[PDB]
Amino acid sequence: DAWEIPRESLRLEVKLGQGCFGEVWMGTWNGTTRVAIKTLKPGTMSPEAFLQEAQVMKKLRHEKLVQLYAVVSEEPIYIVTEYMSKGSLLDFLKGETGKYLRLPQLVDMAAQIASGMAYVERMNYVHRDLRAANILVGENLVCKVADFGLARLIAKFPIKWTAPEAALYGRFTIKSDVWSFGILLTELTTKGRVPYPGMVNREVLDQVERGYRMPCPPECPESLHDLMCQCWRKEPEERPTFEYLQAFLEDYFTSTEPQYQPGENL
Ligand SMILES: *CCC(=O)Nc1ccccc1Nc1nc(Nc2ccc(N3CCN(C)CC3)cc2)ncc1C(=O)Nc1c(C)cccc1Cl
C-alpha cells in the first residue's frame, strides 16, 4: 500500500549479515539505486510483526534515522531502506577505522545520534533499544539510528544498556532512552567495549540499584563523564533531554572543552 514495490525490481547482491530482526543484504533497486534489504526468515516468531518496524519507519522520517525506501508484503517479506556503507557502529568502533577515531569524531557521532533521538523525542516516541549495535554508519562518518521494531508512542531490555526502572518495572520512557544514550557514550569513548566490564547481568542490576556508575573512561574528559552521569540519574525526570544533549555535544569543543588536546586514544 503506497510503499509496496514489485519483487522483481530488487536484486539481492551481497549479504551483509544477520541484522536486527532479520537477514540483511546489499542490493540494487531498479538497477540504479543501491539499497539495503532485510528479509524475514519464515516462522521465526514473526508473521507480519516483522513488518511492524516498517510500520513505525513510515511515520518517523528524519535525516539521522535510517530511511525506509520500500516494502514487499508477500512472503518472503522484504524491507528496503537506504544503504549505510560502513555498517554497524559497534563493528566500526571495534574495526580498523576505530584506531584513528579521536574525541572530536566520536563526539560528533554522538551529536548526530542525539539529533536523531531528539527527533524521536519531539515525535513522542520511545526507542527502547538504543545502543551502538543498533546505529549504522555511512559515508563521511554519518551516524543514523536504526532498529525501530520496539518503537512505540506514549534482545529484550539488555540490563547493561536499559534504565533500571525500565528493566524492573517496564517503565520505558524517553528518559530511559537517555539512560541508554549515556551507555552508548561509554561505547564511543572505549572503542566499543562492553559496558560494566567483568559483570554479569544480575550483578549490573544489583550494583546500579545500589548507585554504582561506570567510572570515567581513560583519556575521557571529566566534562563528558559528567554528561554520562546525568544520563544515569536514578530519577528519570532529572535526566537531560535529547535537545540538550544534542546542543551540548555540538558545541562541546568550544563551550565545554576549548583547551582539548589529542591524546593516545582519545
Ligand atoms: C539493527 C540494524 C542492523 O541490522 N544493522 C546491521 C547489522 C549487520 C548487517 C546489516 C545491518 N543492517 C544494515 N546494514 C547496512 N549496511 C552495512 C552492513 C554491514 C556492513 N559490513 C561492513 C563490515 N563488515 C563486518 C561486514 C558488514 C556494511 C554495511 N545497511 C542497512 C542496514 C539495515 O539494517 N537496513 C535496514 C533494513 C534493510 C531494514 C530495516 C531497517 C534497517 Cl536499518
Author numbering: 261 to 414, 425 to 536
What does the paper behind this entry write?
SRC was among the first oncogenes to be discovered and encodes a non-receptor protein tyrosine kinase that regulates many cancer-related cellular processes including mitogenesis, angiogenesis, adhesion, invasion, migration, and survival. Engineering selectivity into Src inhibitors is challenging because of the high degree of sequence homology between Src family members and other receptor tyrosine kinases.
The main difference between individual protomers was variation in an N-terminal lobe loop conformation, but there were no differences in the conformations of the ATP binding sites. DGY-06-116 was easily modeled into the predicted binding site for all, with the warhead forming continuous electron density with Cys-280. As seen with SM171, the p-loop of the Src kinase is bent and thus allows a covalent bond to form, a phenomenon that is not observed with other Src structures. As expected, the nitrogen of DGY-06-116′s carboxamide linker hydrogen bonds to gatekeeper Thr-338. The chloro-methyl phenyl substituent is situated in the back pocket of the Src kinase, creating hydrophobic interactions with Ile-297 and Leu-396. These results confirm that DGY-06-116 forms a covalent bond with Cys-280, but also suggest that hydrophobic interactions with the back pocket significantly contribute to affinity, possibly explaining the high potency of the non-covalent analog NJH-01-111.
